[PDB]
Amino acid sequence: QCVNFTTRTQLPPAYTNSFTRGVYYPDKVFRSSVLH
Amino acid sequence: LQSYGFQPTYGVGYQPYRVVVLSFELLHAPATVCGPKKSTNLVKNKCVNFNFNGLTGTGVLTESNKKFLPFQQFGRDIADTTDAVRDPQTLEILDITP
Numbered sequence A: 001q002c003v004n005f006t007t008r009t010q011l012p013p014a015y016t017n018s019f020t021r022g023v024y025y026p027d028k029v030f031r032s033s034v035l036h
Numbered sequence B: 001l002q003s004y005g006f007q008p009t010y011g012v013g014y015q016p017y018r019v020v021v022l023s024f025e026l027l028h029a030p031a032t033v034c035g036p037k038k039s040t041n042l043v044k045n046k047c048v049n050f051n052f053n054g055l056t057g058t059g060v061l062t063e064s065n066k067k068f069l070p071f072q073q074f075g076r077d078i079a080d081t082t083d084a085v086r087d088p089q090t091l092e093i094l095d096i097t098p
């Protein structure tokens, strides 16, 4: 069922500072005490 | 899209050729499937020729204390050599040193 719920509701997009996020595991290998 | 034309009267090259391609990746992730090679017993504190999921080697086996995360199968040194492994049957962590 298609429903046309009003509109996009004005302009939401604001901005923020992503300090040190977005870090994921690059490979499926265990490592420790190393600056990879 | 353009239509293939395949009839038995066509010669070599124009005939249909069924193709199967495998796109498997190896040994930077835990193994899941392989051949009929049979598992043996486990021995420790002895220089032995181990074989864990296709990774041959030589060294003594000792129960290490490193906590392998479930997506992790291998542990590596500075020189990219394997250092610890999780046995595919018993999920304990074993140190490997030649």
Ligand SMILES: *[C@@H]1O[C@H](CO)[C@@H](O[C@@H]2O[C@H](CO)[C@@H](O)[C@H](O)[C@H]2NC(C)=O)[C@H](O)[C@H]1NC(C)=O
Pocket (backbone or CB within 6 Å): A002, A003, A004
């Ligand atoms: C939501 O909006 C769309 C377009 O604004 C509607 O699509 C129209 O549907 C009518 C029939 O009810 C057609 O005559 C128009 O040509 C359609 N417009 C377009 C641009 O395709 C849609 O029907 C609306 N949703 C509902 C539930 O009515």
Ligand SMILES: *[C@@H]1O[C@H](CO)[C@@H](O)[C@H](O)[C@H]1NC(C)=O
Pocket (backbone or CB within 6 Å): B089, B090
């Ligand atoms: C592996 O599977 C066999 C039978 O499929 C079972 O007997 C054995 O206990 C399993 N390994 C472990 C470590 O439990």
